[PDB]
């Protein structure tokens, strides 16, 4: 009876707008091409469209675009369909509604806070998903970990980080099955665009991101584990971590060393992960390596071959390890949350 | 003068030769390897990661002339075939990827050598020595000893310091490690059957099993059975870093942890507070370099997990430790 | 009237056998999965099948296998179909005919010469294609450059090398349109399995292949240009060349600097290449880079953006440049020749 | 003592500082760069490709203390803002990726410097000097000069030797070149609009335009307009090799070509017959290293095409040439 959900039953097309056509924005565009009932009808980015079209067609790590891309006067012709490309620097000036846009992926990195991201509503968009944390009045959502926190009335939400989308389902499964006292994370992580190609002054003052990223093992700080409480309240304040950036251009792996609230065996841990598996959190027993997860659609892929339970006179330390393509795994999660959020809008 | 012979002129054998050139009272007078000496001379002169050789190398009838001195190069395959005594060799560096067994390594004594140091674990009936961690275990009467592995030479002083200052309940190690010659350059069948070492080593993050932490008890009895670990091989050709996450027997602060490491520092175990990266340690002579910038103490309602991290050049750091043990071992004679 | 060709008209299935399941053998298997009317019914390789199945499923440069692979008693289950995998070290002992094999891809590198490769005929196979040169009584075939040299009665043929399959259509187009006096080739080439991962003794005695291949620019000798006469008789003895191996795991590019028999312009050269283009020899005017050709199906991809015509008081030197994936481009050519050879057998 | 000031403490500026430490009678007394001195001190100490600094570096109020001596570090952005004379600087190394113009570079003279050397082409009204190829063109009265590019410093002695011995009709260059800081670490918009420098530089073979061969006439008048070329950038962080394919004015043999290069050899132009690879030249002080193992003479019915190949460390080889020109330029004063 009619306080009912509707968009799940009778929505034809979810029209998406992308503000910021960097790595994530372009990869989200690519994924949406394969999502029935969701399509991008507007891109906004200050870069010359000739440059943007070229980078959409050709991608070092993710391969050639599946289809044709041609620059036109007001935007691109992508697999026939024209798609407007604007270059407004003020989000309040983007007339999203003229292109039917209802939800915006905000991926520039300059409008993270609620009031900043809500500028897209002035142009007529209804909802916004941020490609980063994750402020004071904004929920953080890892799809298939805590998207049930959404009621559909929120205006701005965060898709969390890529590392959070890998860690969260793995840490939650430990908590649900065994209980976590505390734990430390180490991500062995592909280099990224916040590192220098060769040694040189880094804008932020980071003496390690100043170093050649493709020729070094580079320690760097993280926030996923310290901030996990935003996705899994029961783990608030229980985890910390850091990263080692290494010379691959994409593909990463997350290790968690944890003290649990009860004793376990390796098989029990692995069986718990298998039972928690879904389209966001995969399970494998194959001895794969990082190139095997590039382009994959899981947000997180648990690797049962790397599980360890160290038992010393009954005192136990546990290691669990999950793979992720820090590019496409995070993008696949963003797109799941984009669609879900739009469809439970009401 | 300690006259040393080298069996196996691979990465470690060649780098040990380079180091011994600078150890007064130690000199190599006999190399032997089943490779054409022209190939060996070229690989001694030119080294992708460790640079060009300091001096002159010329191939001559029976071996090399290195900085004037001639050095016999043989090509046997049984240590008994090596007349170490004809070249005056007293102690042998055994550095082929095989032969890591006492009876197997004792074959060199028939050729007239007195002592043998094997460049890998092989310690069922053989003492395992990380210099400046436990070389005091040697009395000089041993025939064959092990220099342990390079991961052990990195971990051991760090783990020993935690044990000495605070007590260790248990711990898990992760080493982010340069690729090595037991991995394939491109995807292909690995002779051991390892499905991960069969993969392209310079284009992947590759999980790898280790033994350093599980076998630490051979170097630090007080840690026997308390540790486990594993590795992630990554696309650098040398330079590695070892992380240890441990449960200790008392609560600590970060400053207390770092101060304990500094107090344990010496020529084998370095200390830095500079935010370095892996290229900054390639070629260094410390066996282990503790990095105070990476220390973590997670305290959750008084229960603590501690992370400590040391760097090492898995090539030159290990080699420098081997040569320390070679010199000391020869010095304390029998 | 009935001295007619038949296999082009009424052949149902070309059954292929692969001797040697290395990089090329596995990639040829992958391509054949997408070739209607051609299928592999027998693999012979001395490697443990568990290792071989794993390497077919997971491929660092060419991605995950499109489908499922499962080890069975006598071989593999690949996308349902069972495929026998033997491990005979003597090719005369391979009973190809029991599996209906008519043509063998001989890719071990130990049976290049005619008499050696003809051992496969003892087991009942009819034809053999060698994945390397290219002996004294054996024709060398670059598909869509000189496959018309085949009359279908040959027993053993060579698919040439991967570098030859890139150079040949480019050199032939210059010869046909303008005439070649002489020329020198330089390939900038991915590292390969004949190089060491770290500095160490090389079995062949090559002091450069002994060096770490992923951490160096490594000069190495070639044979494609010196031996081009085997594919293009009119260029016999007119070319020489060499290679620089560089730190990418696949993807290569071939430059030819040539003296021609007449003066030209850059546009004239590029137009000549466009007219010579086909499914083996592509044409592009996009400023691509090496990652953009990994996995591609052209044997050779001419890049019009790199064309140069240096004219000094009327004396001209010309540079033309073509891309190739030294893995998949060569494999795609091998598979074209495999099918054609089987189908004009008669 | 020649007192030098450095504007721009990037790769070249820092490596030139490292070299000048070993040039007696030349010393840097003033650096200025718009970067925080803490960042600059860290990058001087630690260098991914060129190793750790030889000495001590400590940040202090007005700059660095390097091996005791204090060195002022400023952060202006207009050469007139630099009081070179207050620091006694006579000659300025102008090494920011901009300012490659005579009037632009002459701004340093207002601050009290006498001469300027720009670390890139900028030669419309500025002489271009490859040391030991054409530094005899300087008379000492010039204010601003160019050290040319690093590709020019590699090509020039090789091309000059062909011209001197045999005569050059024409030629095309290909350099297989390390990636540089004008390429992206990952695919992304390039500020110049270059669709190839927008691509991940350590994961691709990247075609690149050059100017060294087209502009060679500025260093070797006899080759003006005779050459063209281009580059392939590849995944090494330093170390490069330049190939020249040329039509000569007479027929030659390989031995004749190689002998001519050996006779042209000097401190700027080296000669080797060893089959080296790129890591063997990183850090070398020669501007150019001719490799006789790569020489080709293709003779087809008497018509010849010749290939000659030289190595260079696009970082340190170029820097060593710059510092040679700095010293000479200061020495021949006005
Ligand atoms: Ca869609
Ligand atoms: Ca098929
Ligand atoms: Cl964290
Ligand atoms: Cl272990
Ligand atoms: Cl050739
Ligand atoms: Cl040029």
Furnish the topology, listing elements before pairings.
Four copies of one chain form a homotetramer.
Chain A: H1 7-10, E1 14-19, H2 23-32, E2 38-44, H3 49-57, E3 69-72, E4 75-78, E5 81-86, E6 103-106, H4 114-117, E7 127-130, E8 139-140, E9 156-158, H5 162-177, E10 180-190, E11 218-221, E12 239-246, E13 252-260, H6 266-275, E14 281-284, E15 300-303, E16 308-312, E17 315-324, H7 328-343
Parallel strand pairs in A: 1-2, 1-6, 2-5, 6-7, 7-9, 8-9, 10-12, 14-15
Antiparallel strand pairs in A: 3-4, 4-5, 10-13, 11-12, 13-17, 15-17, 16-17
Helix pairs in contact in A: 2-7, 5-7
Bound molecules: calcium ion (2 copies) and chloride ion (CL) (4 copies).
The site of one chloride ion has 7 residues of chain B, from strand 12.
Report on the architecture of this protein:
Chain A is α/β, with parallel strands linked by helices and 346 residues long. Chain A has two domains: 1-160 and 327-346, no CATH class; 161-326, Dihydrodipicolinate Reductase, domain 2. Chain A has seven helices and 17 strands. Chain A has helices spanning 7-10, 23-32, 49-57, 114-117, 162-177, 266-275, 328-343, and strands spanning 14-19, 38-44, 69-72, 75-78, 81-86, 103-106, 127-130, 139-140, 156-158, 180-190, 218-221, 239-246, 252-260, 281-284, 300-303, 308-312, 315-324. The first copy, chain A, has a nine-stranded mixed beta sheet, with helices on one face. In chain A, helix 2 links the parallel strand 1 and strand 2 (38-44). In chain A, helix 2 (23-32) packs across helix 7 and helix 5 packs across helix 7. The longest helix of chain A has 16 residues, at 162-177. Chain A is globular. The two termini of chain A are 14 Å apart. The relative contact order of chain A is 0.16. Chains in contact: A-B, A-C, A-D, B-C, B-D, C-D. Residues 222-226, 240-241 of chain A line the site of one chloride ion. Chains A, C: Belongs to the glyceraldehyde-3-phosphate dehydrogenase family. Chains A, C: NAD(+) binds at residues 23-24, 45, 89, 131, 326.
